[PDB]
Structure formats: C-alpha cells, structure tokens
C-alpha cells in the first residue's frame, strides 16, 4: 500500500455527479456522471537520534511527529 | 534370501561396501554377456539387481540407525 | 471373479458341457477362469515349423470357460466349498465339507 500514510492508512474511491440542483427553490437537479475518481493524501518527515524520513500525512503529522519526537 | 539379510546385517560399513561393489562388478560380467550366455543369466541380472538393492538398503539403515 | 476362486488344481466333475464326465484339474487361472481340466481337446493346427516335429495339426488345447465345473469330488460327488475352523493349534484350512467332508489337503492326495 504505497500511497498510504503510516500512523494511519488512507487511499479512497469516488464518483462525481455534477449537474444542476435548484431543488428547494424550483424543479429538480440535472445529473449525469458515472466517472470514477481518485481522492488522496501526501508525504514528508524528520529525524531519529539522527538519520530519518517519515512520509506520514498532514493532520497525523501535527499528531505525527508530535508522537515520534515523543519517542 | 533371508541369508542375504543375515550377513547384510552382520557387517558394519565399508566392509559392506567392498561387498556390494564387488557384486556390482559381477553385474558388469552379466551385462557383458548380453551377447551370449543370456540364458540362465536372465535370473542373474535380475537377482543381482535386486539383492544389490538389498545390501544398499541395509547399508542405508545402518547409516541411519548408527549416527 | 477377483482374487476369489475355488479349486487348487483338484478333482472335478463338469456340468454345463456336452461332456459332464470328469477328472483332475490340471491348470487354472485367476483373472480369466477358463481353468483347463484334462478334458476337451481341439486343434489350432500347428504350422510346419521345426519347433514342431514337422507334421501339422496339434491335437490338444484347453480352456473350460465356465466357472461351473462343479467343485470337488469327495466321497460325495458334487459339492460347494464352505469354510473351516482351525481345530489343530494355529491353522486355517478352508476345507471342503458340504455333504462329504474331504480335506483337499495335500496329504496323501491333493
């Protein structure tokens, strides 16, 4: 799983119906899409007792290196 | 015959090999009378093949059941 | 019709035959039955080969296909095999016993 995080684990699927709305004001929305789509995370990291990396993801990086600096 | 198994048990190692190696050379005999003696020899190739398998077997056993 | 049969080589009356007369079984066969029994010669007619004394037509080849040459001839004529026990210490001996009880043992006879 190489675009997951590490403190947690993340890579989800999608469909993306566009099309109109105008529901609660008038008629009813248009819709017309069956297009599957990617929807995804990020990379970056730090240092051990000298020498590291990390990868990780965003919110669980504020959390992340919090943790691991906490050794 | 079970005789064969007697003395096959009785010897311990390399003795048993000088035995079996000889008896193989007796196979070289019988295979070189492929050309002629053939007759009573039939039993010779077959019996020799067999019982040499026997001595190898018991040798395999002693090799196992020793060390 | 497997390992299972009947006769040793034995003494044997026939039934389905056109001969019915009988005497001792000379050879049998397991998988095929056929067991020839010193009865019913035919020909083959041997060629003219030197393995033959040169003259042709052998007088004798034998296969009694039925497994219906009714078994065994004790003092009673035809009878089927039954079982045994042992009686004698350590035995087997699935002896002929129906009506008459001849052994089929290899003692004085077969």
């Amino acid at each position: 799983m190489k675009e997951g995080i590490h403190p947690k684990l993340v890579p989800a699927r999608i469909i993306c119906g566009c099309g109109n709305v105008i529901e609660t004001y008038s008629t009813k929305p248009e819709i017309y899409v069956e297009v599957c789509s990617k929807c995804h995370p990020f990379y970056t990291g730090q240092q051990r007792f000298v020498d590291t990396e990390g990868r990780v993801e965003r919110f669980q990086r504020r959390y992340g290196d919090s943790y691991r600096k906490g050794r | 015959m079970r005789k064969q198994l007697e003395e096959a048990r009785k010897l311990s190692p390399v003795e048993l090999e000088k035995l079996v190696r000889e008896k193989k050379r007796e196979l070289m005999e019988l295979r070189f009378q492929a050309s002629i003696g053939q007759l009573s020899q039939n039993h010779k190739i077959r019996d020799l093949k067999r019982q040499i398998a026997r001595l190898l077997t018991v040798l395999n056993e002693k090799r196992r059941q020793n060390a | 019709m497997r390992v299972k049969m009947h006769v040793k080589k034995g003494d044997t009356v026939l039934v389905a035959s056109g001969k019915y007369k009988g005497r001792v079984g000379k050879v049998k066969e397991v998988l095929p039955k056929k067991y020839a029994v010193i009865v019913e010669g035919v020909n083959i007619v041997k060629k003219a080969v030197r393995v033959s004394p040169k003259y042709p037509q052998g007088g004798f080849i034998e296969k009694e296909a039925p497994l219906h040459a009714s078994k065994v001839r004790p003092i009673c004529p035809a009878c089927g095999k039954p079982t045994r026990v042992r009686k004698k210490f350590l035995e087997n001996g699935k002896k002929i016993r129906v009506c008459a009880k001849c052994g089929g043992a290899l003692d004085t006879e077969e």
Binding site: - | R21, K24, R25, L27, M28, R31, F32, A34, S35, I36, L56 | -
Partner: protein, 94 residues
C-alpha cells in the same frame, strides 16, 4: 550409488578394427565424463588408458503397428590403451 560401473560394449563393424589395435568401444552412462570413463576403465579392468573419446548418439524412428516412439538417448565412448597391452577378452570373444 557412486559406483565404478557405468558401461556396456559396442559391436560395430567399426569397433573391431579398434580391437585390432586396442581402440575399444564401450557404450556408457549418458552422463559419464571423459576422465571418469578413464577411471571407470582402469578400475573395472586394470590398464593404463590414454585418450578417451566420447560420442553422443540417438535413435529416432520407431513404430509399433500404429504408434510412434524413439529409442533412448545414448552415449558411445571410444577409449584406448597405451602399451598396446591388455584387454584381450573383448577381442577374443568377437
């Protein structure tokens, strides 16, 4: 197992000239290897071999009323003797 015995003699019209001057012709175990043909010969008979020659060969064509197969892979082996001495049984036999 690891036995000295790996061979069986040839009867070519060729071979007999070799016997005329001591160039013998054994079939061998189709995975013998020059040097081992040497020692297999010295040991299984007692001579000083010089030169061993080897020679793969194989059957093909062979039919059985209806069906179709091949004679097994096979490995010929010339061998010689240096003095000119020894092995005589083979030339006396035929």
């Amino acid at each position: 197992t690891a036995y000295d015995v790996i061979l069986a003699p040839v009867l070519s019209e060729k071979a007999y000239a070799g016997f005329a001057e001591g160039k013998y012709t054994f079939w061998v175990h189709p995975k013998a290897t020059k040097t081992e043909i040497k020692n297999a010969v010295e040991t299984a008979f007692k001579v000083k071999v010089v030169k061993v020659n080897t020679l793969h060969v194989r059957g093909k064509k062979k039919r059985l009323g209806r069906y179709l197969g091949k004679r097994p892979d096979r490995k010929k082996a010339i061998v010689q003797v240096a003095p000119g001495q020894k092995i005589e049984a083979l030339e006396g036999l035929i």
